[PDB]
Amino acid sequence: GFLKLIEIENFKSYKGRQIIGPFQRFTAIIGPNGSGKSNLMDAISFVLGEKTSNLRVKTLRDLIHGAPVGKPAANRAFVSMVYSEEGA
């Protein structure tokens, strides 16, 4: 089928658990500069798995919320997707 929606925890300006909306056949993510939007794609690649450098980040302990400043949100992060396919 396709990807229904994405769930993030303590990752790239995403405090706590927030349910991102369900994804239709063609949606879009729009916002001004520095709004924290490419990080959604970074999480998509992350749950798919890829080396840290292409996520404009090193050592993979900087990916937690608040880590680039220097004060992490916690030592604990979830990311989770739900794939929706036909046959219910």
Place this chain on the structure above:
DNA sequence: TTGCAGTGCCCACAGAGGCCAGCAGGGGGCGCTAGTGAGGTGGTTTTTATATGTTTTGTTATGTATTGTTTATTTTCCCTTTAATTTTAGGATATGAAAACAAGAAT
């Protein structure tokens, strides 16, 4: 002797014509002068002409500037040869990141 018919003489006063002064006619020759007219001489200027001085024009010589000339040092186009310099593996490093182990903590 006389009357009558006819003659002689003396005068005189118009009568007449030469004499004469007066006076007017024509044209000959001289005394004198006003007023031009022309001709000759002298003065003046003047005008042409001639000679001298100054300046203007023409010719000659020297210096400067322009054009040309064979050098002559660029200069620049064209070779063959290096001296950096770049590119391609090939090995080694490093720093990360899972992975396993060991250490609290809970059940």
